[PDB]
Amino acid sequence: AMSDLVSYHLDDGVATLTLNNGKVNAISPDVIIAFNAALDQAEKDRAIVIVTGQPGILSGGYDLKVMTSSAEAAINLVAQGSTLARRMLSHPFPIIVACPGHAVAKGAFLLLSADYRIGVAGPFSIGLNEVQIGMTMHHAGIELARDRLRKSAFNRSVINAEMFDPEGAMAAGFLDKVVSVEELQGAALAVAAQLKKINMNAHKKTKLKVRKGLLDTLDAAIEQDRQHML
């Protein structure tokens, strides 16, 4: 059920999107469809959005099974996932990503696609391991990382595949805040509470205005990656 993959719950103007897909929350084609459906709903409820995963894991990245099944499937999967990153960055209300543990590859791209990011202290890895396992990074990912990561963490993350612990991921730009595994839900609602205080219309317009460069660049990238990522 798509509603188990990304569950949607609305409470007090916050929509929690909970990804729940097997052992490592892989980003599959169904996951992205679920996400788009959940975000459709979040737009319609005008809600502050909190995206989160399962305990100990945000997401280990794209479904490898789909990725390796064929070049067409890999191409369509990454295009959808990048299109989803672009949609999140252009979302009309604030997106909080509440990371409950590890966030690797596309899972760490989700943190680079949001308005506020919170992670949890502990033995977790956050980073972009694609270069480690043999993948040349796609334009979309390079460009999401370029725009958010601290300049000297950026070549280390993308080019060297450096993995970060939570504090390190906050210093590098994956996270804005590190709390304990137990504080996570509460810290997320507390940031949501502060976002409720801003003007949503001014937020939307400022987000599209600030992010125009990034959004056009992502559209060009998504197309370049289709034609040439492989």
Distance between CA 94 and CA 200 in Å, rounded?
A: 8
Beta strand 126-127 pairing with 116-120: unpaired
- Both tokens of residue 125? 């890895």
**What domains, with CATH codes, occur in the chain?**
1-230 (3.90.226.10)
C-beta neighbour count of 106 within 10 angstroms: 27
Q: Which residue pairs from 178-182 have beta carbons closer than 8 angstroms and sit at least 24 positions apart in sequence? A: 178/118, 178/119, 178/120, 178/121, 179/118, 179/119, 179/120, 179/121, 180/120, 180/121, 181/55, 181/100, 181/101, 181/120, 181/121, 181/122
Distance between CA 54 and CA 118 in Å, rounded?
A: 14
Resolution of the structure, angstroms: 2.5
Beta bridge partners of 127: 104, 163
